[model samples]
Target: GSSEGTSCNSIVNGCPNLDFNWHMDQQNIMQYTLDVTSVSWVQDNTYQITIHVKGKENIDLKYLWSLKIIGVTGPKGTVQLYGYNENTYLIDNPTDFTATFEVYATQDVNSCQVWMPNFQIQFEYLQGSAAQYASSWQWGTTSFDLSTGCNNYDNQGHSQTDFPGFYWNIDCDNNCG
Candidate 1:
C-alpha cells in the first residue's frame, strides 16, 4: 500500500474517477427546432402570432421557457415584448400572444422575421422576479413587426387573450440544428 498527501493548492478540482466512469448513459440529447408557422396583422390591432416548435421535451431543467421580441417597429430601437398568449416563460404553455399596432393591412401569410430580433428565453430569472420589490420590467414600446404592417399599439384592443400550448418535456441536452 502507498500513501499520497494532497494540499488544496496542489489538488485538482473535479477530476473524474476512472473507476466510476462509464456508469451513466452515454447517449447524447436531442436538439430543439423552432419555426414561425403564421403571423397576421389585424388593421391597427394585435398581430395574431403563432410559432411552430419541436423538441421541447428535450429542454433541460433549471431553464425556463422564455421569449423576447427584439428591435420593435413603432418606437424604433426601443426594448419591449408586446403580448403573450400564455406566461412569458415557456416552462409550461408553449405559445399564444397577439399585438395591436399602427398598421392598415388586415393579415398576411408572410414568414419574414418581422420580429427580427425576437428570441426564446433559456431561463425566466433573467427578466427578474415579481416577488422582489426592487424588481422592475417595463412593457411599453413598439414591440414587433411584419413587413408593410403599420404601428398603432396605442389602441385598447391590443390585449393578450390569445390561445395555448405547453413545454411537454425537460431533458433537452443535445443542440442539433
Candidate 2:
C-alpha cells in the first residue's frame, strides 16, 4: 500500500498525475513479476530481448519492482523501470506484466555471444515484520534484520512500508529455504 498512500489515494491505476492510464480497485494486487525468453541481439553490439508475458503477478504497483540480473557471467547493473500503457511494465486490473529488456552487448565483453546459464532475477519486498529481524542469508555467515535495513536497510522491514516483491523460489533444497 506504499504506492497507494503516496499517489493513488483514490485507487487510480498508474500514477495520479499521469494521463492515459487505468484504474485498479481493491481486487488488484500490489505486487507482480515479468519474464522474457528467446533473447535476440537487436544490434551487433546490443542484445534487446522483449518478453510479452502473462504472469500471475500484478504490475499495477509503482516502485514495486527492480531488475537485478544474474547468470553464468554474474549480475550486471541495475535498471530502474517505468510504467507505460503500451510499453514495458504496464499496470492493469488482473493483468499480467509485459515488457522488454534491451541488454546492450557493448556493455559485455563477450559481445552477447554467451548464453547465460543459471540466469536469475532477484527482488526484495519492503515491509515491516518482526520475523524479518532473524533471517540469515549465504550460509548463516551473516544474518539480516529486514526491519533495520541490513545490507542497505535503515529501519528494518518493519519501519518501511514500501515492501518490494519477493525474489527467488524458496525450494527446500536450497540452503534450508
Candidate 3:
C-alpha cells in the first residue's frame, strides 16, 4: 500500500529530561486523564496521532496542557509534527488533538517501523494559589513495525497473536532501544 526502504537512520535534538526540566511528571496527573485518542494509518503514506488531556468531569481546576511529537523515520527519514513544529499549543478545556503527517521512506509497506517516537504531554496550571501553580507531565516513546499497527491484530482484525513480527511491537522490555 506504500513505498519501501530497508535501511534507516535518525537524528534527534532538544529532548530534555522531564524530571528536571519539566515541572510535573506523569505521576502528578492524578486529578485528570491523559490519553492518545487516535493513532491509525490512513491513505497517501500518512498516519494520524492524537493526544488528549482532559480534566475529570467533576473537577475544579484550570490548566493549559501542551503536547508535542518528536520522532524519526527510517532510511534517511525525519519526523514532523504536522503544523505546529517542535511543539504544539495549549489545551485549556478539553478537545481531540488531531495531527496527521507523512514520512520520507520509499520502501515496502511491510518492512518499516517508527523507531522510538516520543509523544510529549505536559501541563501548566493554577493550584492552591498563584505561587502554588505548577506544570507537569511525562514523555512516552514506543515503536511498531509496518506489518502490525500496534497490537499485531490478526489478518481479519479479530484478535492478537504471539507471532514473530506481524503486529504493533511495543518493546517495553528494552524501551525500544
Candidate 4:
C-alpha cells in the first residue's frame, strides 16, 4: 500500500511541499520527496532556481540519479535548455539521503511575456542478488511561470512510478526583483 499528499504554504508565491510513502506489510519502508527551495532572476535572462531531494531506504545494488532542465519558452520564442542537467551515482549505503542543487537559465534574453520551464528528476535503481535487475522512477514539473513565480501547470505525464516511488511537491519564492 502507498499514499501521496501535498501542501502549499503560499500559492501566490509558489510554496508547495510534497510527500510520498510506500507501505509493505503495514510498515512504511520507502519514501520519496521533492521541494523547490528558491527561485530568482540574477541577471537579465539568467534565473537561478534551487531544489531539494530527500529519500529513504536502500536498494540491494546502486542508484543513479539525474536532474534535467528539459526546455524553456517565452516571448523570445521556445528554446531547449539543458545546461543545468546533472547526474550522480551512488553505490554505498543510502538508507537515508538528501541533496540540493541549483538550476540556471541558459538562454539569453532581456524580458519574456510568459516563460515555461521544465524541471525534472529521475532515479534509476539496480537491484537483485547480482544487481542485474533495473527499474526507474521519475518526477517533475513542466509548467512553471517566471513572471508569477508559480508552478500551477500540470506535469504533462512526466511523473512515473515504476516501483513503489511516487509523490512530489514544488515550493517557490517570489520572482526576481
Candidate 5:
C-alpha cells in the first residue's frame, strides 16, 4: 500500500540488523503483483530472501529475476547468491509462485558491506505462446551493511519512478541493535 520506515537498536551478539520487504502492485490492463516477502539472516553473514508472484487475470506471462552484487567493502567478504541466479518462469495462470535464495558473504568478514547495482526483474507478456509485449521493472536497495549486530537501515538508498497503474513500497525492520 505505502512505504514506511522502521528502525531498531539492539546490542546482541550475531544479531541481524537490517531486513527489507518490497511490494509491487500493478492494476492497469495487466493485473499482477510482486512481493519481496522475507529477508532474514541465516547464519554467519548469510541471508535468505524470498519473492512471491501472483497474477489476477489469466494471461500468459514470462518473468525473469536477476540479482548481482557489484562490490563489497569494509571486510574481506564476497557475496554469492545461491539457488536460481538467473531464471525465467512461464505460467499461463499464475498462482502463488515463489522464489527463495540465499546470499552468502564469504571470506569471514567482521564488518562487511555489499553493493548491488543490478537487481531487477523483467516481465514479458506472451500471446499464443509467443512474446507480444515486454516490460522491465527494477527495484532494490543500493547497499547492505552487515557489521555484526549493528542495525543500519538509514544508510540504504532506493530509486523512485512513476508508472501508471503501478505502485510499489518498501518496508524495513531492523531488529538487531
Candidate 6:
C-alpha cells in the first residue's frame, strides 16, 4: 500500500514541475473541479487565468487538461492532477508529466448542471492502487498539492446553481459568446 514511501515526500524531491504558483477557487476541499478552461501557469506554479468572455455565462472547457509548471526557485519535481478519480483522470503517467486534469464539465451547459452548495463535484485523491485510502499518507501525501491547500484552487467547490447574481448562465451551449 506504500509504494511512495518517505521517498515520495516533497514534490521538490522528484516533481518535474518544481516551479508552480498554485490552484485556488475550488470546493472547500473534498470536491473540486476545474472550469473547463486550460489554466496557465507561472514560474511559481501560479495560474495565469486565460478566462475569455465567450458570452455572459458561456465559458470554454477542456477535458483531460494538464498544468504546466514554470519551474520554481526551490527543489524541482513534477505536478499533475492527482485529485480527480485518483489517476482515473490521469493525463500522464510515470510520476512526471504536463500536469493536467480532465474536467468533466464541458462548455456546453447541458454537459454540466448547476452545482449547489448541497451538491458537490467530487474529486478523490487516490492512494496507491486507486483504492479508497487502501494506503495511509501524511501532509503532502494525503492533502491536495497546492500552495494554500484548497484555498489556492479558488472556487472552493461552487457550482452553476451557486450563482443567481451572474447572468452568464448558459444551460446548453459551448463556446457561447
TM-scores for every candidate against the unseen true structure? 0.27, 0.29, 0.31, 0.35, 0.33, 0.20
Please provide, for model 4 over 63-171, each residue's C-alpha lDDT reduced to its tens digit, 9 standing for 90 to 100.
Answer: 3222222222323332222112332343233333333333334432223221314443333333222223333422222112111122332254222221111112122
lDDT for each residue of candidate 2 in 48-87, tens digit (9 for 90 to 100): 4433334234323332223233331223343323223213
Instruction: Give the better candidate number (1 or 2) by TM-score.
Output: 2
List ranges where model 5 is wrong by over 4 Å: 1-31, 60-96, 104-118, 127-175
Model 1 residue 122 distance off true place after TM-score fit, in angstroms: 6.1
What are the per-residue Cα lDDT tens digits for candidate 6 across 107-155? Answer: 2223322111111121223433344433442213222322211111224
Model 5 C-alpha lDDT per residue in residues 14-74, reported as the tens digit of each score: 2222322212222132333444455544444444545565545443234222222223331
lDDT, candidate 1, 1-177, per-residue tens: 111221011111111112111111111222233433433432232233344434424322222223444333333333223213343332342222322222122222232112222323221322233224223322211112221111222133321211111111011111212
Cα RMSD to the true fold for all candidates: 24.1, 19.8, 14.0, 13.1, 13.2, 19.3
Model 4 lDDT, full chain set: 0.30
Q: Please list the C-alpha lDDT of all candidates, in the order they appear.
A: 0.25, 0.26, 0.28, 0.30, 0.30, 0.24
Q: RMSD in angstroms, candidate 5?
A: 13.2
Task: List runs of model 6 lying over 4 Å from the truth.
Answer: 1-90, 93-119, 126-136, 140-177
* Residue-level lDDT for 153 in candidate 5: 31
Q: 9 in model 6: Cα distance from truth in Å?
A: 42
lDDT of 5: 0.30
Question: What is the C-alpha local distance difference test score of candidate 2?
Answer: 0.26
Model 6 gets an lDDT of 0.24
Model 4 residue runs over 4 Å out of place are: 1-30, 58-61, 65-116, 127-177
The superposed Cα distance between candidate 6 and the true structure at residue 29, in angstroms, equals 4.0
Best-to-worst order by lDDT is 5, 4, 3, 2, 1, 6
Ranking by TM-score: 4, 5, 3, 2, 1, 6
Q: Provide backbone clash counts, one per model.
A: 19, 13, 11, 2, 2, 42
